[PDB]
Write a protein that binds this ligand. Structure first.
Ligand SMILES: *[C@@H]1O[C@H](CO)[C@@H](O)[C@H](O)[C@H]1NC(C)=O
Ligand SMILES: *[C@@H]1O[C@H](CO)[C@@H](O)[C@H](O)[C@H]1NC(C)=O
Ligand SMILES: *[C@@H]1O[C@H](CO)[C@@H](O)[C@H](O)[C@H]1NC(C)=O
Ligand SMILES: *[C@@H]1O[C@H](CO)[C@@H](O)[C@H](O)[C@H]1NC(C)=O
Ligand SMILES: *[C@@H]1O[C@H](CO)[C@@H](O)[C@H](O)[C@H]1NC(C)=O
Ligand SMILES: *[C@@H]1O[C@H](CO)[C@@H](O)[C@H](O)[C@H]1NC(C)=O
Lengths: 24, 226, 50, 298, 50
């Protein structure tokens, strides 16, 4: 899908708001 | 004799809708895997109202029709609910009916509206008599169904005079599952559509306390301080 | 935890700020808001430090 | 700096029914009781017309705690309890949150979290009896202190000595109830006053009773202000597909913030999200080179 | 919070400075009448400092 490899694909698949708080 | 109420008798605490959240509240509920009574009235008993009464019933022909909730002797108030005209008839009276209870086939307050478990729930708090219920089509004789069924409020009757007894009025020309309510801490698993499907009592065994402090129904390997 | 600290009381009569401002006009809103501000500020400082 | 839109219109909604209610029925009463009976009325299911109290200048001050008296016309309640007991009007100080006093330790008790009014005022002839005052009597010392808002109907002769005082009053024996023998032409400054307590319940249920404020229409898709029966906020209201069960009124989210609402008049589903805000960031080369700037809204 | 505090006189937040009161029913009693002093009744809006 993006540009990655098989191993990096597994690595991303294996890891898984406005009351003042903000996310950059 | 008795029977074990496996998970029976949990109600929505407050009117606030939610979704997919494990909310924790502190309110009067019937403890999990507790010990409920199993009457064979008819010969009609009189029971306490210590903090709230979880009252089931299994009747296809609906002989379990009335209630009464106090000195009972027309010198103090009452809540004589005769539930047999259209939907409900409720009175707060002191009149000539507290002699010998059976339903055949002053007055400061008034109100007008085996294949099921009329699992009502009664309580009296802060001048607010609250009722809950739900129905479920199950006909297993000696055992309440395994699972979980949340109770859904019906009516709010704010009079708040006094209740320490209650008693059951049936129709004649045979079953009850009376329990009791304690203050417990419950963890409730709301679903997507908004209806509860599971609950965890934080005062049953160490594993449950682990769950309640961990905010999960799934606990993996480790050592957890509680 | 930082978000959950907003619902706390800290000694005032309520946690929601508008309701406090919706019941008490001249000085007593301020005597409660002092406690609210102190508590929230300490929670924020703790969060920044960790 | 920070960036944030401002609301343009404001909307107030609360149920249609008004049913003006008789506040004065307990004010223009017939008879009063001293400490034993106060009838625990439940004035509710109406609109709180507090304008009836401050229009008359023949009353004492609205000296009470929890809410600014002038703000009493813009709060929306659930249940109001009126306490009707009458006591001496020059001793009217013990009715305060957490204060001592004999009548404040063996009689009517106000709680330390009393969020209600204790409005009380003068009494000239309605309270004072004609041709002698023998009826208005209060019970004397009790066994111990009493829990707040608790009745004390039960009466029994106190026993601390060798005498049970079962009708044998005298010779180191007493009976709390006694006749005062107040003739009319006495120290009118000692006359009892009309004392009423209007407790408020801002705790449990969605608001039910409040003032004659006017309800506008609905606005949609706009950073707006709104007052749907206490539920104040700032955001945009779009009709959401959240399937409320009948008894359900509000809506809340994972971090315990108001998220969805229903209309107290039309039963329509709505939700709430903050209207856009953030920060503003300035991008520029060095001022030594040029004076131009680009700006970013986070 | 009073009628005088509403339509007749008022004070600011801190009010550094103070007030003295002494009895005056010795020269201007003016027995039998004495309608030389008035105060304002109901008004639309409240008042502001000084
Ligand atoms: C219920 O109580 C009875 C007697 O009181 C006892 O024999 C029985 O084991 C109890 N069961 C539970 C589940 O508590
Ligand atoms: C209710 O009545 C019983 C006696 O009938 C009494 O013992 C009890 O104290 C009453 N409840 C309250 C809250 O006073
Ligand atoms: C009304 O209530 C009073 C107070 O207990 C009682 O004496 C009287 O008998 C009652 N009358 C009727 C008709 O219920
Ligand atoms: C939610 O309700 C829909 C019907 O509108 C139903 O099809 C769906 O199964 C329900 N969700 C769950 C988790 O049962
Ligand atoms: C009581 O009656 C008087 C005259 O009878 C009336 O002016 C007043 O509005 C009534 N209500 C109150 C609360 O005083
Ligand atoms: C500021 O700009 C001038 C050109 O006008 C340049 O001569 C000077 O060195 C600059 N200042 C610095 C600190 O570079």
């Amino acid at each position: 899908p993006s540009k990655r490899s098989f191993i990096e694909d597994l690595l991303f698949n294996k890891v898984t708001k406005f009351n003042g708080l903000t996310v950059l | 004799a008795y029977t074990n109420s496996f998970t029976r008798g949990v109600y929505y605490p407050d009117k606030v809708f939610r979704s997919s959240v494990l909310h924790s509240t502190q309110d009067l509920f019937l403890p999990f895997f507790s010990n409920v009574t199993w009457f064979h009235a008819i010969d009609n008993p009189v029971l306490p109202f210590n903090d709230g009464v979880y009252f089931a019933s299994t009747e296809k022909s609906n002989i379990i029709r009335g209630w009464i909730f106090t000195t009972l002797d027309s010198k103090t108030q009452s809540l004589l609910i005769v539930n047999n005209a259209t939907n409900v008839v409720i009175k707060v009276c002191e009149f000539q009916f507290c002699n010998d209870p059976f339903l055949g086939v002053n007055c400061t307050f008034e109100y007008v509206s085996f294949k099921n478990l009329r699992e009502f729930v009664f309580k009296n708090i802060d001048g607010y008599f609250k009722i809950y219920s739900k129905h479920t089509p199950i006909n297993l004789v000696r055992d309440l169904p395994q699972g979980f069924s949340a109770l859904e409020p019906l009516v709010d009757l704010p009079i708040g005079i006094n209740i320490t007894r209650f008693q059951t009025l049936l129709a004649l020309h045979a079953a009850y599952y009376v329990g009791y309510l304690q203050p417990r801490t419950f963890l409730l698993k709301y679903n997507e559509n908004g209806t509860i499907t599971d609950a965890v009592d934080c005062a049953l065994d160490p594993l449950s306390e682990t769950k309640c402090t961990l905010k999960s129904f799934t606990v993996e390997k480790g050592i957890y301080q509680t | 935890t930082l978000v959950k600290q907003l619902s706390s009381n800290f000694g005032a009569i309520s946690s929601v700020l508008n309701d406090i401002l919706a019941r008490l006009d001249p000085p007593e809103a301020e005597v409660q808001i002092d406690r609210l501000i102190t508590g929230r500020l300490q929670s924020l400082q703790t969060y920044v430090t960790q | 700096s920070n960036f944030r839109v401002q609301p343009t219109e404001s909307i107030v909604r609360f149920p249609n029914i008004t049913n003006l209610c008789p506040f004065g029925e307990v004010f223009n009463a017939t008879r009063f009781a001293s400490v034993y009976a106060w009838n625990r009325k439940r004035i509710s299911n109406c609109v709180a017309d507090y304008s009836v109290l401050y229009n008359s200048a023949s009353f004492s001050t609205f000296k009470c705690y929890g809410v600014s008296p002038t703000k009493l016309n813009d709060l929306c309640f659930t249940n109001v309890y009126a306490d009707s007991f009458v006591i001496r009007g020059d001793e009217v100080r013990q009715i305060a949150p957490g204060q001592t006093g004999k009548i404040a330790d063996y009689n009517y008790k106000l709680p330390d979290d009393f969020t209600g009014c204790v409005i009380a005022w003068n009494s000239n002839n309605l309270d004072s009896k004609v041709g002698g005052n023998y009826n208005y009597l209060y019970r004397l010392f009790r066994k111990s202190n009493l829990k707040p808002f608790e009745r004390d109907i039960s009466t029994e002769i106190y026993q601390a000595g060798s005498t049970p005082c079962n009708g044998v009053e005298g010779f180191n024996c007493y009976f709390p109830l006694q006749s005062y023998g107040f003739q009319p032409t006495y120290g009118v400054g000692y006359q009892p006053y009309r004392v009423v307590v209007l407790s408020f319940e801002l705790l449990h249920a969605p608001a039910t009773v409040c003032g004659p404020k006017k309800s506008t229409n609905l606005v949609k898709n706009k950073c707006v202000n709104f007052n749907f029966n206490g539920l104040t906020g700032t955001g945009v209201l779009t009709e959401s597909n959240k399937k409320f069960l009948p008894f359900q009124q509000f809506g809340r989210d994972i971090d315990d913030t108001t998220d969805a609402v229903r209309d107290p008049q039309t039963l329509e589903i709505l939700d709430i999200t903050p209207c856009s805000f953030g920060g503003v960031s300035v991008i520029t080369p060095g001022t030594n080179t040029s004076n131009q700037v680009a700006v970013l809204y986070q």
